[PDB]
């Protein structure tokens, strides 16, 4: 079953083609887990969900 | 409106990196201040023929008329020059013919009248007197005097006050005198095979009348042809008979119509449109083109501030 | 060094009474039009 | 508004 | 012939409700339509009872 | 032949697993973040042949430049060169590119 | 049917450009060699 | 080169002619002014178009064109999204319906058809003569707006000056735009100058290539290295 | 449920619109829209509320038919897992397989592309659709008495990638806001 | 099969699941214990 | 039949943005005169009284939607709580701006107002400011209603 | 309350080209990106590409084989 | 794949927290890109040789956010048509439609007067009376007859030589699907292809579909029986 599976994405991903390393910075980003500044902006980004407010905030982040 | 790539040393020579381009007053206005001088009466420069024609041309245009042919030039825009790739040692010109727009002379449209002193006739009207002249109708008779419509449309319709929706008719007659008709608002949806009045003479739009003016141009047969058509047992020979009949229209003895354009005297985007018109992102877009000449050297400033930074 | 063309090849030739019936434009019809162009060049701003 | 509707309504077609 | 009423309900009448037959798949039903401008329709519907 | 999948593979499998194993993509690129094969191959520049032989052709400019330095024009197309210039400050703009639609028309018709 | 709509003249579009007739003659020779 | 034809005369202008269809014909020359071609004198009606073509007396019909202005055209996203450019919207049928119609018999007239009329339509169809457009000029094409834009914003002729000729002269052919009508700028100064100018000049742009090719192999050998 | 159900899509009516057959500018034209209409590609028809938007949905050319091609997910298949086809030569003009006839397919296995277009403001009064429903809808059995006996002529079946096209009309006031 | 009604019923049209909602059935039978 | 559940997520995620500047490449005429038009053209001096009817109805309308608005006491709190929010924010930059201007000149809190009632923390000069500026507006639309009216 | 449509297209804002409704119109606008039916796979296989990349349908079972 | 980068990252998102912290986690280091768009992938190398490795990325990066910009114009046109409300966004007109002159195109627009049919509710045109209209709209009359009027011919143009196989079974042969036609054929030849095992991508022309796996087949099977004749 894990072999189908496989099989499938990677055929999938590879119909691409019928027309430095990255997982060294994709592995350096401050993810939430399931340093300042993010919380503030998530808890704020929150709290102003239903009015227009809201808009300003996109503005802020990277 | 078939084009060509150009592939010859001895033609590339003749024109490099493409032909120079004609400029001067666009068509609209070629005719201004010649005609004005003329009129004036100063000694004005004579138009000098084009280069490709030669003795033997100037004698036949000035003979019996121009042809399509004096009119077709050409132009070529030179590709990628003499060493880039094979297959073009020396390069290769685009060479596509046109007409030009100045062809045509000091020929305009018909001026628009002044539609406030100017009599008026109710579409009613003229629903009755296209269905006089429409041999296609019950109400013809071959004795109505030959009418001349000139059909404006309006064009500063979106750009300053005054402007009206819908057609407006103007008819002459054999007098020489002339009416006009307000064809605004359609009034009922017909097809243009379509003969029936609208049971209520207020409901005449520009729907019915153009159902007329269509159904006034069809083609009259002689019922021999006809005979011709459907008698003869043959095929070849009714095929003959079709090919062979022929036809009148009783609308070149009655009308004349004419399709215009009410130009306009206010351009879209200029400042006597903001006059009449004025709103927000207007004044906004304005004063950011005024900065961006004026004081959008605080895009150098920028740099200024970057020398402390 | 010039080449010389006969002007009365470039002039046209007409024949204005061999023209329709009411083809050419009289007095009174050209000022009316002239005063028409005018009036449609200030009807805007005046208004 | 309900004086000017009858006038007003032919902007659509109706009644 | 498996629907046996039509009701033409609204405010505008465009919307019918129709009452499916015994004689139809899946029993008996009450299905709303909305309807097309189709001058053809009035008399399909009452020529098949 | 022999390319990639059955060097590193080759007596690892069947001929069986050879076909089941090639039909997956060419062999690793962009939808992995890797670099292609073809798109790093524009990332090359040319080779020393590119060197010596824009060396040869520069000689051949030289060549070819100094055998200008030691040209002088001959008598007949100075005297054309008289006339053409006298021609250049005797018209305008307007004629200048009338007789090049003339010139142009002359190659054209023949 | 149809509409007897008419302007009195045209407005050609005249009164950046490089990448106009970049892409123009770009295209064009790219035809040219795709010809053969 | 023979210079072409330069002259001066008073004309009488035209009676100005009202035939229904258009106004004006005031023109009493053969020519027009900035172009060099025949401009027309003979207009057609509507019944006049639509009784040569059900008789046949018409055999092809051309149409002016417009711009058709970028934003109007639905084949990618609009511009302001800040995709990669399209290259051009194809041009419309002429706005304001100009034509020019071609007779049996070698003649050709103006006329104003609205393009999409009922009965033309029709009996175009119905007759099979031939419909065509005409294409744009250069100077209204809005792919050639550089090209125009230069020949207004350029010089005509280079200035060649080695002290004693000040001599107009030819543009390279890089950026020629017409034709070598005049004199190279080679010949201006080999024939008015001096091994000076030559010398130098050929100096100069000799090691101009060779500093070309060798900023070439230098940014090589730097790459590979 | 029965209630439940249909409440829910009331209150919650802008997450039922289409995101699975739409990706991106997803526009055809209104000619080539037409085009598909006449010669049957149109699966099914959906016009909007306002009756002056509509949301076009067309199979993929292989998942049309019930033809065995390997790009459709082998649903239908034989004892010996091969998938089944059902064509029919088309014995009046046969040596072209596109005029040949077979099978459409259950409208819950089609693979849908989603296309959006604009009509114009006479689509009603022109008359197209209302052409293209009478001209579908009025062809069906037939009764021979020659042969004596119930027949379906052959131009009232689906050639190969053609379908029946279903026009479905939404109600405006069920959208609760 | 003449007087087959070619509207199959409310009944035998089986279901078919968007991706969402394999989603959650992957998830909810992957954490079925 | 299977039932169905509400989604609370990102839901629909398409009006959390405004994109008409993007989509009509920036970087209502027709209207108001079809409606004259009409009034004048299906209903002796009768057309000017329509036209009078009409822009009186829709003033009248508008306001009166106003009013009856802000007759909500929730409304009124929320644009006290606003008022108090602008005063302040004013008050900040009426300090730095003054303060910065005559060093120019050199060169060459919230919960008692937020708990207490509306009128007693706002002067009557202020609202005397507002009713004479009123006045001065509107003081003389009795002669020019006179003279449109009369030739 | 305040919103208009034009009366004559009926908000729609766009009429007719019945010259096309029976080299070929040249007043009615410019294809669409979709008209070309031999392009739709293709497009269609690009699009499917980059969507299978985000999707995470079976990201359940893809975390447990990490 | 996860290390791979080829889907998405090992916990960027569950549905369980806050979209709030699931953005953030999406726009940390463009996650919100497939590899094949990512500039970071590409940011080492640009050359003499092309100097497309790193503008023809970026130039497939702007169509790509086109495409989602539409994606969203559009769904906010079917909302706003799901209801009976005008539409936002005024696109330009397409292969079959022109402008509307009236208007500019613009289709409505605000007015400070308060539009009463919306007011009061009338809106809608009464089902039968939009039959009236198109019933009288497709039925036109003919009130004169050829007995008078010398007409015997049909409007239209070309009359006389207006009047001059097996569509009545089978019938028309449709002409959209011609391309498709030499696949058929090739899926009849070859019967075996029509089994539960083979999984083609698909597509129509040589270079897509069923014609890869064909041409695959026939060309390593030639290839590996020459390989047989080396030994
Ligand atoms: C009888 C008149 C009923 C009005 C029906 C016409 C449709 C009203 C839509 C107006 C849109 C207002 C708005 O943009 O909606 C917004 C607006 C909120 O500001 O909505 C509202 O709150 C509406 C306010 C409530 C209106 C009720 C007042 C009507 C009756 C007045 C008193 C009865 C008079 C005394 C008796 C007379 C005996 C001779
Ligand atoms: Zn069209
Ligand atoms: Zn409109």
């Known amino acids: 079953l894990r072999s189908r599976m496989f099989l499938n994405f990677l055929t999938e991903r590879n119909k691409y083609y019928l027309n430095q390393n990255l997982r060294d910075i994709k592995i350096k980003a401050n993810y939430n887990n399931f340093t300042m500044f993010r919380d503030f902006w998530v808890w704020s980004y929150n709290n102003t969900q239903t009015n227009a407010f809201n808009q300003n905030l996109w503005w802020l982040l990277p | ?115 406030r002193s100017l009599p008026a006739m109710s579409p009613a009207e003229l629903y009755a007197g296209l269905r006089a002249r429409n041999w296609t109708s ?103 008979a079709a090919a062979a009949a022929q036809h009148d229209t009783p609308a070149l003895r009655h009308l004349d119509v004419s399709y215009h354009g009410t130009g306009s005297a206010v351009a879209p985007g200029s400042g006597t449109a903001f006059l009449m018109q004025p709103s927000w992102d207007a004044v906004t877009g304005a004063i950011r083109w005024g900065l961006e000449r004026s004081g959008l050297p605080e895009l150098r400033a920028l740099r200024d501030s970057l020398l402390p930074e | 060094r010039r080449e010389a063309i006969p002007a009365e090849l470039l002039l046209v030739k007409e024949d204005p009474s061999k023209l329709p019936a009411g083809v050419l434009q009289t007095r009174e019809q050209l000022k009316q039009a002239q005063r028409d162009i005018n009036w449609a060049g200030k009807r805007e701003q005046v208004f | 508004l309900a004086l000017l509707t009858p006038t007003l309504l032919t902007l659509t077609g109706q009644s | 012939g498996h629907v046996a009423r039509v009701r033409f309900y609204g405010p505008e009448k465009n919307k019918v ?25 009035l008399d399909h519907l009452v020529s098949n009872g | 032949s022999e390319d990639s999948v059955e060097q590193e593979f080759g007596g690892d499998y069947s001929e ?95 | 049917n149809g509409h007897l709509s008419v302007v009195s003249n045209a407005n050609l579009l005249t009164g950046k450009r490089l990448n106009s007739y970049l892409i123009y003659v770009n295209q064009n020779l790219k035809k040219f060699i795709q010809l053969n | 080169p023979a210079l072409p034809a330069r002259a001066t005369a008073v004309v009488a202008p035209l009676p100005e002619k009202n035939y229904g269809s258009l106004r004006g014909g005031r023109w009493p020359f053969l020519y027009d002014n ?157 024939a008015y100058g001096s091994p000076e100018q030559l010398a130098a000049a050929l100096d100069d742009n000799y090691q101009a290539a060779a500093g070309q090719v060798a900023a070439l192999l230098a940014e090589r050998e730097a790459w590979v290295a | ?175 609760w806001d | 099969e003449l007087m087959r009604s070619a509207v199959p019923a409310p009944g035998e049209v089986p279901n078919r699941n968007s991706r969402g909602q394999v989603a959650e059935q992957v998830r909810a039978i992957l954490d079925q214990y | 039949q299977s039932e169905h559940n509400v989604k609370i997520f990102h839901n629909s995620w398409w009006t959390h943005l405004n994109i008409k500047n993007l989509v009509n490449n920036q970087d209502s ?69 003054n303060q910065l201007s005559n060093k120019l000149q050199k060169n060459l809190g919230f919960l008692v107002e937020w708990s207490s009632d509306f009128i007693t923390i706002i002067p009557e000069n202020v609202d005397i400011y507002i009713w004479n500026v009123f006045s001065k507006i509107y003081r003389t639309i009795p002669l020019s209603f006179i003279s449109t009216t009369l030739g | 309350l305040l919103q208009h449509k034009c009366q004559r297209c009926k908000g729609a804002g766009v009429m007719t080209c019945p010259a096309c409704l029976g080299g070929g119109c040249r007043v009615c606008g410019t294809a669409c990106a979709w008209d070309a039916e031999s392009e739709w796979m293709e497009r269609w296989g690009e699009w499917e590409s980059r969507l299978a990349y985000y999707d995470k349908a079976t990201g359940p079972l893809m975390d447990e084989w990490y | ?115 009463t049919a919306v007011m009061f509710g009338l809106e809608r045109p009464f089902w039968g009376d939009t039959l009236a209209r198109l019933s009288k709209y497709w039925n036109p009359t003919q009130v004169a007859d050829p007995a008078r009027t010398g007409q015997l011919l049909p409007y239209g143009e070309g009359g006389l030589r207006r009047l001059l196989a097996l569509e009545a079974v089978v019938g028309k042969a449709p002409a959209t699907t011609g391309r498709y036609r030499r696949d058929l054929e090739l899926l009849l030849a070859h019967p075996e292809l029509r089994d539960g095992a083979l999984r083609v991508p698909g597509g129509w022309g040589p270079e897509g579909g069923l014609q890869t796996y064909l041409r695959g087949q026939q060309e390593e099977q030639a290839r590996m029986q020459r390989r047989r004749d080396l030994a």
């Open chain 13, 1 to 115: 794949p996860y290390d791979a980068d080829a889907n998405l990252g090992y916990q960027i998102v569950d549905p369980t927290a806050s979209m709030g912290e699931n953005v953030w986690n999406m726009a940390q280091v463009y996650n919100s890109l497939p590899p094949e768009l990512n500039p970071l992938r590409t940011q080492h190398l640009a050359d003499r040789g092309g100097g497309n490795t790193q503008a023809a990325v970026e130039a497939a990066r702007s169509a790509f956010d086109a495409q989602v910009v539409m994606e969203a114009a559009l769904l906010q046109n079917l909302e706003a048509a799901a209801q009976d409300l005008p539409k936002p966004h005024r696109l330009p007109p397409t292969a079959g439609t022109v402008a509307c002159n009236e208007c500019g195109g613009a289709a409505w627009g605000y007015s400070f007067f308060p539009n």
């Open chain 11, 29 to 97: 005429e027709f209207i108001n005169s079809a409606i004259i038009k009409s009034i004048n053209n299906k209903t002796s001096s009768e057309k000017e009284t329509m036209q009078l009817l009409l822009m009186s109805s829709s003033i009248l309308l508008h306001l009166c939607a106003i009013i009856s608005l802000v007759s909500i006491s929730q409304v009124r709190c929320f644009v006290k709580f606003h008022l108090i929010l602008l005063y302040k924010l004013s008050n900040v930059y009426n300090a730095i701006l």
């Open chain 8, 34 to 190: 900035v172009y060099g071609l025949p401009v027309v004198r003979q207009v057609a009606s509507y019944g006049e178009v639509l009784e040569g073509i059900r008789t046949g007396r018409i055999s092809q019909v051309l149409w002016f064109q417009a711009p058709r202005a970028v934003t109007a055209s639905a084949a990618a996203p609009p511009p302001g999204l800040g995709g990669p450019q399209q290259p051009q919207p194809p041009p419309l049928a002429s706005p304001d319906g100009r034509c020019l119609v071609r007779f049996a018999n070698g003649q050709v007239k103006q006329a104003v058809i609205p393009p999409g009329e009922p009965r033309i339509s029709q009996a175009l169809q119905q007759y099979g003569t031939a419909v065509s457009y005409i294409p744009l000029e250069p100077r209204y094409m809005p792919e050639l707006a550089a090209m125009r834009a230069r020949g207004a914003q350029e010089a005509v002729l280079g200035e060649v000056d080695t002290g004693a000729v000040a001599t107009p002269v030819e543009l390279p052919e890089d950026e020629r735009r017409g034709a070598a009508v005049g004199p190279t700028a080679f010949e201006a100064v080999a």
């Open chain 2, 1 to 115: 409106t078939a084009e060509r790539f150009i592939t010859d040393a001895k033609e590339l020579n003749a024109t490099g990196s493409g032909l120079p381009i004609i400029d001067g007053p666009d068509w609209e206005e070629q005719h201004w201040a010649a005609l004005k001088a003329m009129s004036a009466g100063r000694p004005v420069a004579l138009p000098t023929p084009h280069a490709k024609f030669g003795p033997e041309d100037l004698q036949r245009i000035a003979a019996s008329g121009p042809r399509l042919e004096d009119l077709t030039l050409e132009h070529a825009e030179r590709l990628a020059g003499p060493g880039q790739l094979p297959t073009a040692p020396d390069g290769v010109a685009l060479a596509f013919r046109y007409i030009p727009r100045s062809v045509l002379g000091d020929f305009r449209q018909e001026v628009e009248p002044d539609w």
């Open chain 9, 1 to 175: 449920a029965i209630f439940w159900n249909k409440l829910l899509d009331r209150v919650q009516y802008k997450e039922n619109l289409p995101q699975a057959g739409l990706v991106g500018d997803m526009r055809i034209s209104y000619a080539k829209f037409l085009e598909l209409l006449k010669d049957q590609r149109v699966k099914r028809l959906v016009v909007y509320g306002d009756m002056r938007t509509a949301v076009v949905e067309v199979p993929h050319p292989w998942s049309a038919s019930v033809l065995g091609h390997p790009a459709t997910h082998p649903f239908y298949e034989d004892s010996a897992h091969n998938r089944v086809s059902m064509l029919r030569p088309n014995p009046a003009a046969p040596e072209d397989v596109t005029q040949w006839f077979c099978a459409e397919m259950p409208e819950w296995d089609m693979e849908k592309y989603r296309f959006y277009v604009d009509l114009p403001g006479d689509f009603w009064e022109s008359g197209v659709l209302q052409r293209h429903l009478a001209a579908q809808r009025a062809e069906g059995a037939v009764w021979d008495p020659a042969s004596g006996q119930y027949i379906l002529p052959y131009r009232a079946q689906k050639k190969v990638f053609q379908v029946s096209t279903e026009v479905q009309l939404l109600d405006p006031q069920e959208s």
């Open chain 6, 16 to 110: 069986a697993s050879l076909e089941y194993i090639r039909a997956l993509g060419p062999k690793k690129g962009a939808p992995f973040a890797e670099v292609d094969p073809a798109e790093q191959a524009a990332a090359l520049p040319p080779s020393q042949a590119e060197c010596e032989a824009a060396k040869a052709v520069l000689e051949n400019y030289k060549r070819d430049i100094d055998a200008l330095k030691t040209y002088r024009p001959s008598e007949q197309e100075r005297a054309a060169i008289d006339a053409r210039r006298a021609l250049a400050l005797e018209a305008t703009p307007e004629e200048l590119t009338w007789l090049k639609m003339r010139e142009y028309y002359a190659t054209q018709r023949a």
């Open chain 5, 17 to 41: 409700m129709a009452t499916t037959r015994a004689s139809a798949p899946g029993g008996e039903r009450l299905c709303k339509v909305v309807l097309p401008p189709d001058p053809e329709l």
């Open chain 2, 138 to 240: 019950a109400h013809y008779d071959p004795a109505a005097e030959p009418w001349r419509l000139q059909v404006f449309s309006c064009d500063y319709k979106h750009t300053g006050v005054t402007g009206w929706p819908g057609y407006r008719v103007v008819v002459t007659s054999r007098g020489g005198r002339r009416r006009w008709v307000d064809l605004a608002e359609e009034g009922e949806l017909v097809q243009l095979t379509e003969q029936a009045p609208p049971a209520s003479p207020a409901d005449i739009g520009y729907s019915h009348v153009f159902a007329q003016l269509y159904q006034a141009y069809e083609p009259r047969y002689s019922p021999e042809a006809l005979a011709a058509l459907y008698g003869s047992s043959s095929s070849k020979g009714k095929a003959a």
